[PDB]
Homo-oligomer: A and B are copies of this chain.
């Protein structure tokens, strides 16, 4: 009566499992998760990567707290180069990037970068891969697309926790905002979805969901 399974070695992305180590000035673990990066933006010019990058420091000032410090320093340097310390959940490394906030690049905001304050540890894990999408499903109507989209978070009206299925029944009548990364645009976007367990198809979204090493946002072979 022995196991019919054994162990084998496989390649996995470096930004998985237990990270040794972190090397973060300021010593914190939270920072500003870079989500959407607009076209022709200072954030773009600075090479901020959607989903993978975290702004952890500006001009030497560590960003441990969810306040107005980052927004004030940008507002105080509106056309001047600013230095940012960037943490990558992909390379697990820190890099210095120059960025110049501006009102003159024609988009919304001073960075052209949508951010959210959160922790960057196991942030490469909390990803839900959109698989198949039924016709006329809530997922379809909201703009979710099969296989190209990965759900990476939500605008949390109400509060509970973070895993995905644990939101869509609780928003059974109310619209839900989702953070959706796309592997063609390599960018996040806002999707507003109206969950319905009785829409007339699978689940409350009408789409499949994958989680795990088979369902992560892709990474290049080399740094």
Contacts and interface: CB of A to CB of B under 8 A. Distances in A.
Contacts of A210: 131, 208-211, 214-215
Interface residues of A, number: 71
Contacts of A148: 218-221
Interface string A137-181: 000100101111100000000000101111011000000000000
Chain A residues touching B, majority SS: loop
A135 B11 CA distance: 6
Copies of this subunit: 4
A3 B220 contact: no
Interface string A25-36: 000000000000
Interface of A: 1-19, 90-91, 122, 125, 131-136, 140, 143, 145-149, 161, 163-166, 168-169, 182-186, 197-198, 200-203, 206-216, 218-223
